[PDB]
Amino acid sequence: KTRSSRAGLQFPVGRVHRLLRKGNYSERVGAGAPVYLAAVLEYLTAEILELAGNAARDNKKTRIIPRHLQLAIRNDEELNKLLGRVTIAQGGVLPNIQAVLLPK
Amino acid sequence: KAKTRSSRAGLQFPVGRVHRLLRKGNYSERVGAGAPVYLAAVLEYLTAEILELAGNAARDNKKTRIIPRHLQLAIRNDEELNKLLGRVTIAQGGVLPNIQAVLLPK
Amino acid sequence: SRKESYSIYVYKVLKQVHPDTGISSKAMGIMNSFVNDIFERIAGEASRLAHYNKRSTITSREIQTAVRLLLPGELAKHAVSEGTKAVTKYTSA
Amino acid sequence: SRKESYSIYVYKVLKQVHPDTGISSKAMGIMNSFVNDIFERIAGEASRLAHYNKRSTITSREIQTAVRLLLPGELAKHAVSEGTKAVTKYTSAK
Amino acid sequence: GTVALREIRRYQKSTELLIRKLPFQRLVREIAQDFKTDLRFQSAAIGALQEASEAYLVGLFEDTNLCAIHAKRVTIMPKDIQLARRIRGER
Amino acid sequence: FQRLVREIAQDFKTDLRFQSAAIGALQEASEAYLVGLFEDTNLCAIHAKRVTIMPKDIQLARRIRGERA
Amino acid sequence: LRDNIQGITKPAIRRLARRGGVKRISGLIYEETRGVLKVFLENVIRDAVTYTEHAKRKTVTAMDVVYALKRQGRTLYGFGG
Amino acid sequence: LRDNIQGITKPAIRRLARRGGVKRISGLIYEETRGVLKVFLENVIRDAVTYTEHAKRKTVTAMDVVYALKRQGRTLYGFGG
DNA sequence: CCATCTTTGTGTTTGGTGTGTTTGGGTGGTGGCCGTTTTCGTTGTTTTTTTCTGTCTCGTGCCTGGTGTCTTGGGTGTTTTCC
DNA sequence: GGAAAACACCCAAGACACCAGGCACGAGACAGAAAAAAACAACGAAAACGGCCACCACCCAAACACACCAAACACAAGAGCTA
């Protein structure tokens, strides 16, 4: 019955359609636009959550912490390229020391 | 006689044209009456300031023709105008003459 | 009151990719902000494309080209493929 | 299909501020692009800021606040004062 | 020199805020007072300001460390601060 | 420069005609970008007590500008 | 309130530099860092207080500060938006 | 068209560096400037190409170029923007 | 650094409902399609021109080693001021 | 009310700055080479406009179930102490 089940998606297509209609972007919205946008959102959130789960597993943790999200974002070239101008609250910084500063 | 809103408000910029562009530029269903007048006044002030500084900079160059060079000189030599127009490149504007102090010989 | 969030759907995709992994509330807010930001970027750029070509309708095409415009590299290609597959699966159902 | 432009008004204000100075067609294009860009910036900021407060109207207040948000320094104060002067001058006539 | 690397490793592995809350709160209120009087403040706005300022200062210090590294030095100087700010575009 | 622009554009989809105004705009943008990068690289060289710019200053300027990750 | 920027202590600046991986610190760094922090705080607070003034509010909310940093290209995740 | 990256000749890039106030030029810098120019041109050309492809056209116009540049925060005045 | 007994406070699940998403039909126009014109983009040829390429000499700017000092770093005990 | 941390003071150690020296490497100018630039003509892919025609999305109206709040109990890993 739901458009999400027809499109094989978990994100609500109707919610995206309503946000596009009442968001003052254009006069009319096609039927394929919310489905496409929901699929893109689901793929991106699945990718970042997959990398966050991998980072949490590597850190021997069971709950994802914003530290793990920061690590997952900063260890991925495409994601941190996309999210260059984003600062994650309570995320810290990536551990990096310069080669020439290490002691001798 | 149907007097223009620009003449009613004492402006040179077209109030009707900016009103139409605001109404047609997909912002909000309805547009207040004072917003096109205010926007046209702001645009007038900004173009007056820019054209004034450009005409002055041309006057130091002993020229009667305003070129992109004078516009670039007027924009980059004013602190607040440089702050506002920071991330724009003026076509055929050139670069301000700037030589570093320690770059020079002794 | 009635505040909207993407909590349930993020929970579903999380249990899809990691059934045994949980997530904190601060991370949930971070995910909601991320989804809202990406949604705003793609929808606004699609509207801008519609404005450029003197068109009044947002279809799958302008959304697709906005996805190629914003996302960098392989990401954009896989997102375009996934969206196209979702569109034809919806159209054939 | 005559493309609209701000050329005549820019020439009017230049003749107002500099009676003895002319302007090249390229400088006219740059001035037109500048006016258009400032228009889009202020209009988009006003539309967003209006959308934040769940409001349907762009009034003089939204334009004034957008001008204060964008213009840096004395430019903002002078533009706001002259815009308010224009608004009250329009309101005093009919 | 050893305790410098210990501090680097500890703070780069930690996630808590390093700026003390009450002096930053008083600084924010003192700065905001001269724009408008009798100003109230939500706690979450102050926390957001603290987090953003800390992230910005960490990024500035990283770029400044790069600038110091360029000049064959290990100690950061104020000239590195204004070099990083000038190149990044702040005035 | 026009041949270089055509060479770069050839890699995506051929039979792409390029108006003279587009080529001129691309040239102006490239010159502005290169002039700004060289100003930053001159600042980098001056900071390192040198008067000759090196590729390491180019890489550092791009790094701090954010263009290079 | 008078001369409160000095409340940002010298060990706090030390810790912030340690987070950035800095090994040695000159004595003149702290005052310049305090000035930079003051400039940044003033820039954000100006836009935030303008957003509060337009909405006829008397309290600064988190949403205004987020919106204001986003308008400065400093988008914040975790506090709404 | 085969490897015309050498068309950006050494006196030309010397002139471009000279406008920036640079007094001396290293011998190894020219390949680096050619590389960064190639990268920038690659990005802008890519964005202009997909803008044109969305418009169902076969010729890239100046409007697509100015649009792509303005979308990268490099707004260009003077070409019908 | 990880690990275990014990704490806890916040994640996860479950019932009720109301509001938001789903079905049905009708209209009007946005947009797809085709066809014609005609502007402009490419591709090709010739001369003048001016810059680009190459080679030779060498002036001075970049890099390396030594001294020392003064500048910052480390440890300690206390008060205080942040929680 | 409480306790962890800034701050002043005193020793020490090592990196920055300056001097001196040497080398090599771009800079400058002359000669030879290139091909960019401007003018000019031809062919034609394709862009803007116009007219037609239809499927697609908006609008009202009725309906029901997913997603919200309230409220409940579970259990991840943080607290300190061991090795």
DSSP secondary structure letters along D3-57: ---SHHHHHHHHHHH-TT-EE-HHHHHHHHHHHHHHHHHHHHHHHHHHHHTT--E
State whether residue H19 sits within 8 Å of chain B by CB: yes
**Contact of C75 with A82, CB cutoff 8 Å:** yes
- Residue pair D90/B8 in contact by the 8 Å Cβ criterion: yes
Instruction: Tell which residue, D89, D69, D77, D87, has the closest CA to residue B35.
Output: D87
Evaluate whether chains E and A are touching (3 or more beta carbon pairs less than 8 Å apart): yes
Q: Using the 8-state DSSP alphabet, how is residue C2 labeled?
A: -
Give the integer Cα–Cα distance in Å for E90 and A7: 48
* Residue A25 DSSP class: S
Alpha-carbon gap: A51 to the closest alpha carbon of chain B (Å): 35
* H65 interaction partners in chain F (CB closer than 8 Å): 22, 25-26, 29
Residue A43 contacts B, CB cutoff 8 Å:
no
The residue of chain H nearest to residue B85, with distances taken between CA atoms, is H75
User: Can you list the alpha helix ranges (DSSP code H) found in B1-106?
Assistant: 5-9, 15-24, 34-60, 68-76, 79-84
Contact E19 G8 (CB under 8 A): yes
DSSP conformation class of B30: E
Q: How far is C23 from chain H (nearest CA, A)?
A: 35
Q: Report the C-alpha gap between D72 and B81 in whole angstroms.
A: 8
Nearest nucleotide to E77 (CA to C1') is J16
Eight-state DSSP code of residue G75: E
- Contact in structure between A26 and C47 (CB atoms under 8 Å): yes
Which H or E run contains A28?
strand A28-29
Query: What whole-number distance in Å separates Cα of residue H32 and Cα of residue H34?
Result: 5
Q: Is H43 on the interface with B (CB under 8 A)?
A: no
Q: Report the SS3 class of residue F33.
A: helix
How many angstroms separate the CA atoms of G78 and G56, rounded?
26
In sign, the C-alpha dihedral spanning D24, D25, D30, D32 is positive
d(Cα C74, Cα A42) in Å, to the nearest integer? 16
CB atoms within 10 A of CB G21: 23
Residues E9, E14: Cα–Cα separation, whole Å: 9
Structural domain of residue C80, as residue ranges? 1-93
> Whole-angstrom Cα distance, residue C48 to residue C28?
30
User: Within 13 Å of residue B52, how many CA atoms lie on the same side as its CB?
Assistant: 10
Q: How far is H24 from chain D (nearest CA, A)?
A: 34
Q: ∠D80-D86-D91 over CA atoms, to 5°?
A: 125
Question: How many other C-beta atoms can be found within 10 angstroms of the C-beta atom of residue A7?
Answer: 24
- CB-nearest partner of F26 from H17, H44, H80: H44
CA atoms within 13 A on the CB side of B27: 30
Q: What six digits make up the tokens of A56?
A: 């949490």
Q: E85 and E72 in contact (C-beta within 8 Å)?
A: no
Q: Residues of G52-65 as b/e, b for ≥16 C-beta within 10 angstroms?
A: bebbeeeebbbbbb
Contacts of C28 (CB under 8 A, 6+ apart): C5, C7, C10
Nearest C-alpha neighbor of F34 from the set A42, D56, H8: H8
Selected for mutation to probe chain H from B87, B92, B104 (highest H CB count within 10 Å) is B87
Best residue in G45, G51, G54, G69 to probe D by mutation, most D CBs within 10 Å? Answer: G54
- Write the CATH number of the domain with boundaries G2-81: 1.10.20.10
CA of B84 to C1' of J35 (A): 44
Q: Tell me the C-alpha distance between H67 and H64, whole Å.
A: 5
* DSSP label of G5: G
Which token pair is D93? 């006539």
Which residue's entry shows tokens 């010298």?
A: G10
Report the distance separating Cα A76 and Cα A94, nearest Å: 12
Q: Collect all residues with Cβ–Cβ distance below 8 Å to A1 and sequence separation of at least 6.
A: none
For residue C3, say whether its CB is under 7 Å from any atom of strand J: yes
For residue H75, the cross-strand partners are B88
Where are chain H's structural domains?
2-81
CB A64 within 8 A of CB A50: no
- State whether A81 and F66 contact (CB < 8 Å): no
> Tokens 């003192």 belong to which residue?
E30
Q: How far is G80 from G77, CA to CA, in rounded Å?
A: 7
Tell me the technique behind this structure.
Answer: cryo-EM
From the CB coordinates, do chains E and H have 3 or more pairs under 8 Å? Answer: no
The conformational region for residue H11 under phi > 0 = left, psi -120 to 50 = alpha, else beta, is alpha
- Distance separating alpha carbons of residues F19 and H80, to the nearest angstrom: 14
Q: C7-17 and C25-52 helices cross at what angle (nearest 10)?
A: 110
Nearest partner of B48 among D78, D13, D31, judged by Cα: D13
Single-letter amino acid, residue G74: R
Structural domains in chain A? 2-104 (1.10.20.10)
Segment D34-40 long-range contacts (CB within 8 Å, at least 24 positions apart): D34/B47, D34/B50, D34/B85, D34/H77, D35/B43, D35/B46, D35/B47, D35/D6, D35/D10, D36/D6, D36/H81, D37/B88, D37/H75, D37/H77, D37/H81, D38/B42, D38/B43, D38/B46, D39/B18, D39/B21, D39/B39, D39/B43
Distance F56 CA to I52 C1' (A): 28
Specify the DSSP element, H or E, that contains E50.
helix E43-70
Say what the resolution is, in angstroms. 4.3
Query: Please, do chains F and B touch (3+ CB pairs < 8 Å)?
Result: yes
For chain C residues 46-85, those near strand J by a CB cutoff of 7 A are: 57, 59
Residue G38 CB burial class (10 angstroms; 0-12, 13-18, ≥19): middle
Q: By the 8 A CB rule, do G14 and E66 touch?
A: no
Question: The tokens of F62 are what?
Answer: 């791009």
Say which amino acid occupies G31: E
Tokens read off for C30: 């971070």
d(CA E69, CA D15): 55
CA distance A48 to A93: 18
CA dist H49 and H64 (Å) reads: 8
Best residue in F28, F40, F41 for a mutation probing chain B (most B CBs within 10 Å):
F28
Cα H2 to the chain's mean position, in Å?
Answer: 18
Mode of pairing for the β-strands spanning G59-60 and B30-31: unpaired
DSSP β-bridge partners for residue G75: A86
Q: Is the CB of A53 under 7 A from strand J?
A: no
What is the rounded CA–CA span in Å between residue F58 and residue B28?
A: 46
State how many domains chain C has: 1
The three-state DSSP-derived secondary structure of D53-87 is CCCCEECHHHHHHHHHHHCCCHHHHHHHHHHHHHH
What residue has token string 């575009």? E89
Q: What is the CATH number of the domain that holds D57?
A: 1.10.20.10
Copy the structure tokens of residue D20: 């003895």
Q: With beta carbons less than 8 A apart as the criterion, state whether B51 and D17 touch.
A: yes
**Does residue E71 contact residue F48 with C-beta atoms inside 8 Å?**
yes
CB within 8 Å: H75 and B89: yes
* Residues G70 and E52 sit within 8 Å (Cβ to Cβ): no
Strand F52-53, strand H24-25: pairing: parallel
Query: Which stretches of chain H are DSSP H helices?
Result: 10-19, 29-54, 62-71
